[PDB]
Swiss-Prot record:
The organism of origin for this protein: Homo sapiens
Outcome when changing H61W: Impaired activity, rescued by 4-methylimidazole (4-MI). Impaired activity, not rescued by 4-methylimidazole (4-MI)
Effect of substituting L194A: Reduced CO(2) hydrase activity
GO biological process: angiotensin-activated signaling pathway; carbon dioxide transport; morphogenesis of an epithelium; neuron cellular homeostasis; positive regulation of cellular pH reduction; positive regulation of dipeptide transmembrane transport; positive regulation of synaptic transmission, GABAergic; regulation of chloride transport
Protein name as catalogued: Carbonic anhydrase 2
Gene name per UniProt: CA2
Cellular component terms (Gene Ontology): apical part of cell; cytoplasm; cytosol; extracellular exosome; myelin sheath; plasma membrane
Subunit record text: Interacts with SLC4A4. Interaction with SLC4A7 regulates SLC4A7 transporter activity. Interacts with SLC26A6 isoform 4 (via C-terminus cytoplasmic domain).
Residues the record marks as site: Involved in the binding of some activators, including histamine and L-histidine: Q89
Residue ranges of domain Alpha-carbonic anhydrase in the record: 1-256
Length: 257
């Protein structure tokens, strides 16, 4: 039932998922001036050398690229984190227009899209158990602006027409997610939630300061996907983002300046 329209969009979610109005919801606006510099935050460790992508799927809300997370192959550690988080999937949120699309904002600025690389804490043994814990997930968020092409995104853009509608999937092997990373790993971090239902409050958010650039043609291809299944009337998969939620009693910490 939930989705991103007038009748089932983010403002309706609280009726099925009351945690929507909870104490640590995401995304948030990142006010760069009042984010607190913390010189004890460690550099983020992104070890994606042994990553094994498996498959790409249209789940009716976004497309996921899923990875084999049955061993420590692509992990996030360090930064604000304790222990090892294993990469399970990444996906994006994007707009109908280049002027919106991101879930987090920076001094109220929206970006054209936002990448989420979702990782789960290996001390909970799998993703389903991790989401039930306040430190179960670490999500690395990367903003996309429109400008030059991101060559490491093209393999993703080129498969999308094979997963146009809800429920479609395709083999997606040997995709290297290091090709989606900007040069700097400077980040903001705060405790928050999944930004889609069930909206569980289980996420340490790690949001990179530096956006990657993708071309207008790359982001246009995301907008040709469909929220509907093959049987049904075409509804373009656009504006699949949740707006900024109240920061409430939280401080966003910065790894820099
Ligand atoms: N926007 S978010 O980064 O906060 C986020 C997650 F953190 C996340 F873990 C997931 S996941 O739990 O479903 C990964 C499971 O393999 C999704 N969304 C994925 C999804 C898939 C099907 C239906 C709904 C959501 C997701 F959207
Ligand atoms: Zn997301």
């Amino acid at each position: 039932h939930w989705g991103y329209g007038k009748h089932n969009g983010p403002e309706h979610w609280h009726k099925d998922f009351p945690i929507a109005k909870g104490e640590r919801q995401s995304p948030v606006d990142i006010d760069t001036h009042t984010a607190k510099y913390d010189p004890s935050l460690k550099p983020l460790s992104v070890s994606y050398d042994q990553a094994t992508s498996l498959r790409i799927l249209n789940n009716g809300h976004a497309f996921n690229v899923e990875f084999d997370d049955s061993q420590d192959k692509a992990v996030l550690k360090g930064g604000p984190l304790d222990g090892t988080y294993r990469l399970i999937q990444f996906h994006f949120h994007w707009g109908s227009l280049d002027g919106q699309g991101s879930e987090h904002t920076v001094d109220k600025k929206k970006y054209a899209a936002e990448l989420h690389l979702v990782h789960w804490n290996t001390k909970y043994g799998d993703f389903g158990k991790a989401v039930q814990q306040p430190d179960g997930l670490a999500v690395l968020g990367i903003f996309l602006k429109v400008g030059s092409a991101k060559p490491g995104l093209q393999k993703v853009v080129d498969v999308l027409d094979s997963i146009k509608t809800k429920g479609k999937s395709a083999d997606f092997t040997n995709f290297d997610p290091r090709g989606l990373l900007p040069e700097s790993l400077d980040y903001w971090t705060y405790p928050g939630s999944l930004t889609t239902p069930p909206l569980l409050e289980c996420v340490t958010w790690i949001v990179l300061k530096e956006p990657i650039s993708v071309s207008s043609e790359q982001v246009l291809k995301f907008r040709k996907l469909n929220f509907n299944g093959e049987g049904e009337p075409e509804e373009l998969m656009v504006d699949n983002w949740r707006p900024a939620q109240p920061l409430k009693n939280r401080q966003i910490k910065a790894s820099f300046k």
